[PDB]
Structure 1
Amino acid sequence: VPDATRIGRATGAKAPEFQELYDFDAAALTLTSAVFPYDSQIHRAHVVMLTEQGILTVEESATILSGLAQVDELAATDGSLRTYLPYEAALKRTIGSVAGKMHIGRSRNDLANAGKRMFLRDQLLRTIEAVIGYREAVVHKAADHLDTVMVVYTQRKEAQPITLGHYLMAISENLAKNLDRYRELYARINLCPLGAAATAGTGWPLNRDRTSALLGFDGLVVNSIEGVAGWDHVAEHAFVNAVFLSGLSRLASEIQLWSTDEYQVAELDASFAGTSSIMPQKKNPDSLERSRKAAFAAMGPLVGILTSLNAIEYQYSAARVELEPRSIDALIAATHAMTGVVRTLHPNKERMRQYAAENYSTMTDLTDMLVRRVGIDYREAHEIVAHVVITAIEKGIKANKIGLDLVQEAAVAQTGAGINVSADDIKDALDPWQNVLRREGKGMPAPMSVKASIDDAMAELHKDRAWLANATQALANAKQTLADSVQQIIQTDRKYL
């Protein structure tokens, strides 16, 4: 059975990234199920720490740890065992009374705060990886389009000539700052609240630093109230998601306008477009609109979380709203889809240049040339050239057909006086490629300037990747240390006690 939506102009299959936008809702885990594996790791880390501290014997510890593996397997097909007291009860049914001792010095409150942090931590690295992939596609695309002349818009009106490369590096700069937001967040997420217990710590002699290290955290949430009451990192995670996706929505919208029947300066790759069940001419930007949809929806968790924090005291509270897996899954789907849209986008270079040459985006350079050549002030030059445009539109004269006579008449009609410039001066001013070449400062569209930005972006991308590799490795190392510690205890008890 082929994909039934791939009919008419929707040729070939959906891109995998495009398909993700249709799968995440049904596939999403509940927060409870997403967090559960991390809770299991926390049980191991906590028990191991209690063993170092002499609160549990190695014998007790080995019995508990073997039990945890058994209950974990039970919970793999029984969701009802994925919350704490049901899990603890299953453990008790499995290994007996000693199961109760795993909760010494601990609460569901700091367990839950830690488990959710571990989940969000993982998802943050997942997100950073996706955003890096997005930025890579944007920067690589830009590098192929240093001389792809096109107009930039302001207020959805043609403004001045740029290049597609120049436009994409605006997106790269946006993404660089969002990557900073995410990395800044990570430092606050990756703190361990365990040892706070209910909210006030415990008389038991815990070593909070050990539990933290065994679970890959880079530090503690120190104060025990902050350990269970603290939730700002959840709000912040939802915020960075929302603001990052708003930038993604803006790009999606930009490309959607570019690929209208009327603009026609770009075309989506077929693998990122759909069609209509009734209108056979449609090549629809379903990838773009579903990506925007995700962006809009990301507003929801942000507001829900902040509302819930505004509504309570500085306490542990079961009333706090969560950042849920399905929300993060939508972000990843949209980010992947837009990565693919950007990679495979088909610019219509000839039409791009035609608009740049014909629809008056070159008028600023005409105005600048008057100021530079004849020394009149910018406001008067502007009024002259505005008159040129008004007359050209009235007479049906494209910008690249404007010559000396039209500019003279406009000058006279507008100021009573002619103006002392040549036909060659005007011709050069109205050449859209020369508009691009003139704009050669930092961050401007001239190829040498955009190329400088790309070189800088490539270096930053290397650091983005290095940061991600280091963060990921730190967690992998901790998880290996923990697994090794668990096996040491279980095997030594089995054979040598």
Structure 2
Amino acid sequence: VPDATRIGRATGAKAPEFQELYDFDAAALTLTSAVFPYDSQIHRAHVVMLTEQGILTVEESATILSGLAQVDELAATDGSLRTYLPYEAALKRTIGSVAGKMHIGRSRNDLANAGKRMFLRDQLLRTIEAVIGYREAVVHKAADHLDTVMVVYTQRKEAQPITLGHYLMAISENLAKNLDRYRELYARINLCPLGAAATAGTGWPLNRDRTSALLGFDGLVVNSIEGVAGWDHVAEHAFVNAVFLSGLSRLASEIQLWSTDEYQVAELDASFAGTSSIMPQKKNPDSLERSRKAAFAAMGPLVGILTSLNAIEYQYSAARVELEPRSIDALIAATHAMTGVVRTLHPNKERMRQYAAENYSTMTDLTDMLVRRVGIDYREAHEIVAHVVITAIEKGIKANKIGLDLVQEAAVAQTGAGINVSADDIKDALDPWQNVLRREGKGMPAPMSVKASIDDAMAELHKDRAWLANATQALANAKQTLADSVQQIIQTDRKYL
């Protein structure tokens, strides 16, 4: 059965990144189902530590640890066993009374806090990976468009000449700082609240550093109230999602205006556009609009979370709003989709050059030139060139046909004085590619300037990937160390007692 939406101008298949936008909603787990595997890790690491502290005998420990494996498999099909007390009770039906001892010196409060942190931890690494993939597409694309002269806009009005590479490296710098936000957040998420128990700790001599290490954390949430009452990292995760997607919305909006029937300076790749069920001519920006809709929706969780924190005391509370899997799934899908839009975007280079040359974005260089040559102040030069534009529009003269006669009229009509400049000066000022070549300082659109910041982004991307790799490898190490300690106890009990 074919894809019934790939009709008319929607040729080929949806790009896989484009399809994500339609799939994540119905495939998203509940928070309960997504956190549940991490709770089971906590059960194992907590029991291991209880064993190493002499609170559980090695017999008791091995019986429990083997029960968790059995119950974990039951809960794969029985959703009711995914909250703690149903889980504990089913473990008691599987190995008996000893099951209850896995909760010594522990609570649902610090269990839930740790499990949700572990879930948000992986989803944070999942996000950093996607945001790195987003930046790479952006930077790779910039490197191919150092010569693609085009206008930049301000207030949705043509401003000055630049290049597509210049524009894309603004997104790279936006994404670099969003990656810092995410890494900063990670340091506060990857703290372990286990050992806080209900909110006040326990008399049982737990080793909180041990449970924290086995579960992949880089440190502890020290104070026990903060361990269960702390939620600011949930609000911050929601925020960074919101702020990052707002920049993604702006790019998607920028590209959507580029690809209007009236601009026609860019065209979406067919694999990222849909059609209309009624209007055959439509090549619709469904990818851009559905991506932005995910950006708008990220406002919701952030507001919900902060409202819930403003409404309570500094306590554990069941009234606090969560950051849900479906919210992150939406962020990932949009990020993947815009990664694809950017990689496959088709710039219409000739109409780009045309707008830059004809629609008066070069007037600033005409103004600056009068100031460089005849030495008038900028406000006066600006007033003359304004008259030039006003007159040229009235007379239908495109910017690149503006000449000496017209510049002389405006100076006269505005100051009574002529102005001492040559036809060649005007010609230089009105050449959009020279507008680019002259803007060669740090962060400006000249090729050697944009290439320089691309090289910097290359070096920064290598560090981004390195940070991601070390963080991913660290969690894998602790996960492997935990699985070893678990088999160690199960085999020790099997052989020596």
What TM bracket, shorter-length normalisation?
Answer: over 0.9
Work out the percentage of aligned pairs sharing the same amino acid.
Answer: 100
Other structure's SS at 1:183 match: helix
Other structure's SS at 1:397 match: coil
* Equivalent residue, structure 2, for 1:82: 82
Could you report, residue by residue, the CA deviation over 1:264-322 in whole angstroms, capped at 9, with x for unpaired residues?
00000000000000000000000000000000000000000000000000000000000
State the distance in 1 between where 2:168 and 2:5 align: 31
State the distance in 1 between where 2:427 and 2:486 align: 78
Could you report, residue by residue, the CA deviation over 1:156-193 in whole angstroms, capped at 9, with x for unpaired residues?
00000000000000000000000000000000000000
| Shift of residue 454, structure 1, vs aligned partner | 0.1
Could you report, residue by residue, the CA deviation over 1:332-353 in whole angstroms, capped at 9, with x for unpaired residues?
0000000000000000000000
State the distance in 2 between where 1:387 and 1:295 align: 42
| Shift of residue 233, structure 1, vs aligned partner | 0.1
Could you report, residue by residue, the CA deviation over 1:28-51 in whole angstroms, capped at 9, with x for unpaired residues?
000000000000000000000000
| Shift of residue 494, structure 1, vs aligned partner | 1.3
Structure 1: 5+ residue stretches without partners: none
State the distance in 2 between where 1:268 and 1:449 align: 28
State the distance in 1 between where 2:394 and 2:469 align: 60
Displaced runs of 4+ in structure 1, greater than 2 A? none
* Equivalent residue, structure 1, for 2:159: 159
| Shift of residue 73, structure 1, vs aligned partner | 0.3
State the distance in 1 between where 2:485 and 2:277 align: 59
| Shift of residue 368, structure 1, vs aligned partner | 0.2
State the distance in 2 between where 1:264 and 1:36 align: 50
Other structure's SS at 2:151 match: strand
Other structure's SS at 1:115 match: helix
State the distance in 1 between where 2:60 and 2:374 align: 92
| Shift of residue 492, structure 1, vs aligned partner | 1.2
Structure 1 vs Structure 2 CA RMSD? 0.3
* Equivalent residue, structure 2, for 1:407: 407
When normalised by structure 2's length, the TM-score is 1.00
| Shift of residue 496, structure 1, vs aligned partner | 1.7
* Equivalent residue, structure 1, for 2:108: 108
State the distance in 1 between where 2:87 and 2:218 align: 28
State the distance in 1 between where 2:461 and 2:156 align: 31
Other structure's SS at 1:216 match: coil
Could you report, residue by residue, the CA deviation over 1:56-105 in whole angstroms, capped at 9, with x for unpaired residues?
01100000000000000000001100000000000000000000000000
| Shift of residue 207, structure 1, vs aligned partner | 0.1
Other structure's SS at 1:153 match: strand
| Shift of residue 495, structure 1, vs aligned partner | 1.9
* Equivalent residue, structure 2, for 1:379: 379
When normalised by structure 1's length, the TM-score is 1.00
Q: Map 1:414-493 to 2 at 5 A.
A: 414-493=414-493
State the distance in 2 between where 1:165 and 1:39 align: 46
State the distance in 2 between where 1:414 and 1:144 align: 44
State the distance in 2 between where 1:199 and 1:429 align: 70
Other structure's SS at 1:316 match: coil
Report how many aligned residue pairs link the two structures.
Answer: 497
| Shift of residue 491, structure 1, vs aligned partner | 1.1
State the distance in 1 between where 2:397 and 2:315 align: 70
State the distance in 1 between where 2:86 and 2:104 align: 17
State the distance in 2 between where 1:164 and 1:415 align: 38
* Equivalent residue, structure 1, for 2:351: 351
State the distance in 2 between where 1:456 and 1:74 align: 51
State the distance in 2 between where 1:341 and 1:7 align: 20
* Equivalent residue, structure 2, for 1:10: 10
Could you report, residue by residue, the CA deviation over 1:449-483 in whole angstroms, capped at 9, with x for unpaired residues?
00000000000000000000000000000000000
State the distance in 1 between where 2:488 and 2:152 align: 64
Structure 2: 5+ residue stretches without partners: none
* Equivalent residue, structure 1, for 2:225: 225
State the distance in 1 between where 2:203 and 2:422 align: 90
State the distance in 2 between where 1:61 and 1:25 align: 40
Could you report, residue by residue, the CA deviation over 1:380-420 in whole angstroms, capped at 9, with x for unpaired residues?
00000000000000000000000000000011011111100
| Shift of residue 370, structure 1, vs aligned partner | 0.2
